[PDB]
Design a protein around this nucleic acid. Structure first.
Ligand SMILES: Nc1ncnc2c1ncn2[C@@H]1O[C@H](CSCC[C@H](N)C(=O)O)[C@@H](O)[C@H]1O
Length: 327
DNA sequence: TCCATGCGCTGAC
DNA sequence: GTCAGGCATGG
């Protein structure tokens, strides 16, 4: 994550729904905002969240009485994407994990915050011929909010990872916000190799497959894209090796393959998965953030997480708009 | 709400 | 054609 000099969100309160690792909290707090409520039902996610923030999030949001939630100015929610990912069944709203948005609507209807800040996968904008997005837009409009949505790629915001997500920002109408804008992209100057740990700390992650097949030669010039160098097995998900001179592929939470949830990388002549810490760095998490003791749960959590830097730029712009109150 | 891995198709080219 | 992006099942 980066450092924010002008704390645009100072004095504002927000709630951390579907908290997970707490990426939204890190981002909003870096801007001076105060967290007054968090919710997450995963046991292991609750443990890591408590390790880094000192409090346990409330459980299953579907069984929480919205009136119970503390007044707040901004509602943050990176809700479940498994039902919308192109890698799954795309049942969307017909999936038990695809209805959480309505829980969000339910909370908004009661608390009416100034801002609703949501996140999901890129496919959310196209899912079901765009009906899924329209449903969200209309729901928010009927709740008396403006709706701003855009897919952003982490690689355009200083992070060496290809992670395209849809960001949806909504301002309550009585605030008359007409100047909100998604941050503009900029040149990437950091690559996977620059975030790697020393070889002496990841020897155990090295994988030596006899069926490795180099499909491309290692490049010598860094580039803002994923560069596949080869594959193992049939080359499916988790069986693809990439160059550290390029950017990391998107981290997976439920993915498989021999290089499961991180993908494989060519490092100093050897192929290996990424270490939890490296996963934290590709997600913009500061080295001071404590990862969950179970590496398996750590990979899962980062796979589901958001990129801190992208949320920071957006949070700053939300604040910039809320603070423009000329006479 | 355990950990591991071979898929087996989908969306955007 | 090229390639990035959870489910099912075994222990
Ligand atoms: N009914 C529910 N109540 C509370 N949390 C839920 C839920 N259904 C799913 N979740 C949680 O929703 C999260 C979606 S992924 C969220 C990532 C998070 N924003 C980050 O910063 O790391 C997961 O951690 C998952 O366990």
């Amino acid at each position: 994550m980066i450092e924010i000099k002008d704390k645009q969100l100072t004095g504002l309160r927000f709630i951390d729904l579907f908290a997970g690792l707490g990426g939204f909290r890190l981002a909003l707090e870096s801007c001076g905002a105060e967290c007054v409520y968090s919710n997450e039902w995963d046991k292991y996610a609750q443990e890591v969240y408590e390790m880094n923030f000192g409090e346990k999030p409330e459980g299953d949001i579907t069984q929480v009485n919205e009136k119970t939630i503390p007044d707040h100015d901004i509602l943050c929610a990176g809700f479940p994407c498994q039902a919308f990912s192109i890698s799954g069944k795309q049942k969307g709203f017909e999936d038990s994990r695809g209805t959480l948005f309505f829980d969000i609507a339910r909370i908004v209807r009661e608390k009416k915050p100034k801002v609703v800040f949501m996140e999901n996968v890129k496919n959310f904008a196209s899912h079901d011929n765009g009906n899924t997005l329209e449903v969200v837009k209309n729901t928010m409009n009927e709740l008396d909010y403006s709706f701003h949505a855009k897919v952003l790629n982490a690689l355009d915001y200083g992070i060496p990872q290809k992670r395209e997500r849809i960001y949806m920002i909504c301002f309550r109408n009585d605030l008359n916000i007409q100047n909100f804008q998604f941050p503009k992209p900029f040149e990437l100057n950091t690559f996977v190799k620059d975030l790697l740990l020393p070889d002496s700390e990841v020897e155990h992650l090295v994988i030596d497959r006899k069926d490795l097949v180099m499909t491309n030669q290692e490049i010598e010039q860094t580039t803002p894209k994923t560069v596949r160098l080869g594959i193992v097995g049939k080359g499916g998900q988790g069986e693809r090796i990439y160059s550290t001179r390029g950017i990391a592929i998107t981290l997976s939470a439920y993915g498989g393959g021999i290089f499961a949830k991180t993908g494989g990388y060519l490092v100093n002549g050897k192929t290996r998965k990424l270490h939890p810490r490296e996963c934290a760095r590709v997600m913009g998490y500061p080295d001071s953030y404590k990862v969950h003791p179970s590496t398996s749960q750590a990979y899962k959590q980062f796979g589901n997480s958001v990129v801190i830097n992208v949320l920071q730029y957006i949070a700053y712009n939300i604040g910039s708009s809320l603070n423009f109150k000329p006479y």
